Amino acid sequence: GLTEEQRMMIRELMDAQMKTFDTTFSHFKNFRLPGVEAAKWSQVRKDLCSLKVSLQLRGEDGSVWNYKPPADSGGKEIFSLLPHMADMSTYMFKGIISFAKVISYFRDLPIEDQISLLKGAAFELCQLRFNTVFNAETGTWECGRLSYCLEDQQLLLEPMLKFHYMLKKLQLHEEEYVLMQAISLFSPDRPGVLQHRVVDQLQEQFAITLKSYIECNRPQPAHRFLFLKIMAMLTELRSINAQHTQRLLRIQDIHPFATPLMQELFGITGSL
Numbered sequence: 001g002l003t004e005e006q007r008m009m010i011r012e013l014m015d016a017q018m019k020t021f022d023t024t025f026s027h028f029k030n031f032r033l034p035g036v037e038a039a040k041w042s043q044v045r046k047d048l049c050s051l052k053v054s055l056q057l058r059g060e061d062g063s064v065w066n067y068k069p070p071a072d073s074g075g076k077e078i079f080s081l082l083p084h085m086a087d088m089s090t091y092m093f094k095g096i097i098s099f100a101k102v103i104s105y106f107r108d109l110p111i112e113d114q115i116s117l118l119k120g121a122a123f124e125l126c127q128l129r130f131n132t133v134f135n136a137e138t139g140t141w142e143c144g145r146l147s148y149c150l151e152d153q154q155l156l157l158e159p160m161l162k163f164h165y166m167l168k169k170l171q172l173h174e175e176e177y178v179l180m181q182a183i184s185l186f187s188p189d190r191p192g193v194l195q196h197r198v199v200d201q202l203q204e205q206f207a208i209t210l211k212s213y214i215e216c217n218r219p220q221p222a223h224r225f226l227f228l229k230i231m232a233m234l235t236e237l238r239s240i241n242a243q244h245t246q247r248l249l250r251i252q253d254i255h256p257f258a259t260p261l262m263q264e265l266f267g268i269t270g271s272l
């Protein structure tokens, strides 16, 4: 029950996803690994505690490395995973940027608005892509030969983590994830967007396509209100990206770690 525009639209997004989402992370390599005042630090210590995972690395030859992070002993060991996480984020961001740049609706926008939309939505799209490799039975993001496991059920208090569990519960299709990415990418209200009305119209068409996709392919009474649930999750995603953004900026304030691409997306000038 989708129109021809809508069917073309979903195809173009699925195409962009297929070309730019390295789902086995095969080309994530050369990354760093952990080695072998006052009220800021209290806040940053709390910040880093929420971002805590163990790391497993499965060698192509069959070997396995496992890293268990330290406890907070009041020092600098709380920063040990930041260079690795910066490299993973950077790698995800490159995929996100490539995703946007092959979408016709995005390429047609002026360059400054392209940049403003990517700066506004990079994290959100990264989180949506991470959700598709999140294993909610083991609390593990399965990134090909890398796995990141939550240290350990009072962790669902963390809004990022509650989001991943709730979104995974909806059992979305690939098409529904990529429409979510599009709706978040084409948010007309990001800082610096000039063409508000053009982006808003595009956003509305992505949401209408999603509504129609669901109505036509999900008749089960379990998926009643699925569209509205998804849209409320998108609002939650925006809110937690703002929280997560401020958290990384606090951490970055006292222990620098953003790569140049992360700095670009943050608007960090390299000046002081």
Ligand SMILES: Clc1ccccc1C(c1ccccc1)(c1ccccc1)n1ccnc1
Pocket: 050, 051, 052, 053, 085, 086, 089, 127, 130, 141, 148, 160
């Ligand atoms: Cl992606 C990211 C960047 C910086 C810090 C933490 C995370 C995190 C993650 C995701 C996949 C693989 C390793 C870490 C992360 C890990 C644990 C707790 C919070 C965030 N992530 C961002 C959003 N959802 C998950």
